[PDB]
Write a protein that binds this ligand. Structure first.
Ligand SMILES: Cc1ncc(COP(=O)(O)O)c(/C=N/[C@@H]2[C@@H](O)[C@@H](OP(=O)(O)OP(=O)(O)OC[C@H]3O[C@@H](n4cc(C)c(=O)[nH]c4=O)C[C@@H]3O)O[C@H](C)[C@H]2O)c1O
Ligand SMILES: Cc1ncc(COP(=O)(O)O)c(/C=N/[C@@H]2[C@@H](O)[C@@H](OP(=O)(O)OP(=O)(O)OC[C@H]3O[C@@H](n4cc(C)c(=O)[nH]c4=O)C[C@@H]3O)O[C@H](C)[C@H]2O)c1O
Lengths: 365, 364
């Protein structure tokens, strides 16, 4: 048996005709930038997240960055982020000049440990970016408290959590503003690079709009040193179709994991756990084990495709050396990075395929 | 009759099906980021600009930014640029933490005045961004001269110049590196936002690449604090289809212009001219007039669409006020920005259309 780590076939096949039609439809329109699908996606997406506004942009990274910027964050400003997130959450910060400051997660959730944040706060602090990793939220209520107390803007980095709920509410409406990636492989993935911001803050929004468009609100006029990071009319169209089935497919994903969660019985592996306040969307299904490479190789030899998120920690990436951190400053993220692994869980996976993985996992050593 | 400033129909009708098969083919392959179209297009394009390497990216603004960033450029740095170019040229400099230094253009060619380049060099100056506006080359020759004189990085901003030639040499093969925009409306447009960078410089090419990819050149490892600016497989395939006839559409464009060139004669309209060393691609066929506005409206009420490239100066833009410039500070530009104006010129315009265009123009 051979099980790819990730496979689009099913959901793609599933809407092929409808996708082909969206495309034929806009191509005929010969309008590819800042138009209709942009508007309706934004409106619908914002609707989906239960917040006033949505501004589409070029990618999830860009989403965050635009938000800090719209917040006017940059040099000699600092921003809290979880030690164990995708480096993309850090660039964003760095991209403004601001300084990302790391906070460890709670190994039980893979998400930033609130109880750990205050201690990171400083005169320079300006914001905290709570990332919803793997598809389940950060403990927003607690995070909230502290942000308030300190008057920090709280930004959700919701790239991996489309359609997730925290205590019954939509990821996207839990902080001051959220950022999303529509990268191909997401729960809601574009057919290319894509991202978007969502906020109830009209001003933040308006600004962010302009910055994504050369810093311009009207023709021939440029009010800021913006850039160019928009979401193509094509991608937005593709998103509109997909958004109708997000909830649908996410429940399937949930069904698979439940199945993983009941089935795996191997002492060396810790399976992932859905936070009590969470409705996990399982962007990824991660397990941890001591001899991860071994497990990984075993699995691969068994036709089972895996990936790690992420074997290498931001503070240990050569791109962040300057900071001068080393093995031991974030042991937790360190540990995780060393034992972590992601198993297949794509929409369309079949029991046979699913049982199969459980079985080889359970038979590991 | 009605004349659209632009109009993609003709071409798109023209390639509609092969486009669609490209789309269909890609979707079926479900591989959407950094794949074989990206790879093929890159190769195809570098070859077309006759350089060694091409690095696909998000848009022409990113492309510039990427070149600079790749060249370490940023803070405490100065980059020279036409005072009359598209703002994007400057935003790029700025995103890097560098400071844009503007140089007037040769009104004859609306392109950066080389004579004028040297007086702006400061010891902070690292590159000059020569822009090939509206479809033709700045005069690169003395510029390299200058650049070399000062150990500067010469960067072409070829976003408006797909396939224009300079003394027969292809745009994008002229300095240390070029930036292209695949904005849909360009001579070679994608079906969304698109950018490409070209160069023969392997180390930069290799750097831009990693940068464009979260500063990564190897899964799981990131060496630079980079960004996310790539060219979608979709967009890439689209272009590959387009690249083929880029050359052919560009010629028709040409006839349109030559046409206008003969036929337009009105004492208050200064028709644009193609430099001697150039193979103009006419991304934009711009004319100047002391009564620019009334002319526009005039042309408009006659159903002729036009645009302005551009009405306001980077330096006169709210965005660059920190710059503390004011009218008069950059006269040559201040001037064009007030008299300039773009008229329809799109693959597929019919004789009559053109005729109706010159006709009214003549009538003013
Ligand atoms: C020197 C220089 N450097 C860097 C850059 C940055 O390149 P970029 O970041 O890739 O945009 C530019 C871009 N430069 C151009 C700039 O010249 C300008 O060109 P423009 O005519 O003003 O823009 P336009 O009004 O959108 O479209 C031209 C016509 O095409 C039609 N159209 C347009 C679209 C998008 C469509 O889907 N369907 C249509 O029918 C309607 C319009 O009348 O504004 C663009 C956004 C920039 O990319 C540049 O010129
Ligand atoms: C918390 C957080 N913040 C910000 C960001 C940044 O948002 P962004 O700028 O939009 O990427 C991320 C990004 N998130 C992800 C990051 O987690 C990681 O995801 P990945 O699973 O490691 O990369 P991948 O190998 O492409 O993942 C998916 C699988 O899907 C298959 N695939 C992929 C593609 C693109 C395809 O076309 N066809 C395929 O079949 C191949 C792989 O097996 O790296 C990505 C490039 C980022 O987009 C994030 O997690």
């Amino acid at each position: 048996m051979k099980i790819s780590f990730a496979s689009f076939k099913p959901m793609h096949d599933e809407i092929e005709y409808e996708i082909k039609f969206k495309f034929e439809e806009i191509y005929k329109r010969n309008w590819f930038i800042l138009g209709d699908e942009d508007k309706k996606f934004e409106q619908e997406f914002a609707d989906y997240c239960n917040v006033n506004y949505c501004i589409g942009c070029g990618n999830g990274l860009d989403a965050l960055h635009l938000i800090l910027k719209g917040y006017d964050i940059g040099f000699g400003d600092e921003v809290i982020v979880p030690s164990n997130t995708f480096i993309a959450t850090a660039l964003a910060v760095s991209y403004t000049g601001a300084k990302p400051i790391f906070v460890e997660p709670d190994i039980r959730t893979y998400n930033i440990d609130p109880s750990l944040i205050e201690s990171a706060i400083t005169e320079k602090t300006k914001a905290i970016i709570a990332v919803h990793l793997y598809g389940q939220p950060a403990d927003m209520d607690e995070i909230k408290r502290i942000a308030k107390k300190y008057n920090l803007k709280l930004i959700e980095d919701a790239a991996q959590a489309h359609g997730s709920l925290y205590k019954g509410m939509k990821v996207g409406s839990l902080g001051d503003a959220a950022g999303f990636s529509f990268y191909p492989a997401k729960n809601l993935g574009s057919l290319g690079d894509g991202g978007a911001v969502v906020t109830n803050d009209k001003d933040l929004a308006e600004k962010i709009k302009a910055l994504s468009n050369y810093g311009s609100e009207k023709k021939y006029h440029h009010i800021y040193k913006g850039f160019n990071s928009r979401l193509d009319e094509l991608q937005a169209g593709f998103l509109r179709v997909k958004l109708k089935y997000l909830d649908k497919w996410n429940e399937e994903r949930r069904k698979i994991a439940q199945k993983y969660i009941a089935g795996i019985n191997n002492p060396n592996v810790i399976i992932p756990v859905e936070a009590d306040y969470a409705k996990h969307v399982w962007y990824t299904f991660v397990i941890r084990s001591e001899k991860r490479d071994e497990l990984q190789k075993y699995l691969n030899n068994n036709g089972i495709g895996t990936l790690i998120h992420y074997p290498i920690p931001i503070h240990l990436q050569q791109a962040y050396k300057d900071l001068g951190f080393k093995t031991g400053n974030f042991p937790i993220a360190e540990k995780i990075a060393n034992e972590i692994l992601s198993i297949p869980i794509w929409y369309g996976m079949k029991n046979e395929e699913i049982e199969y993985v459980i079985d080889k996992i359970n038979a590991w050593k």
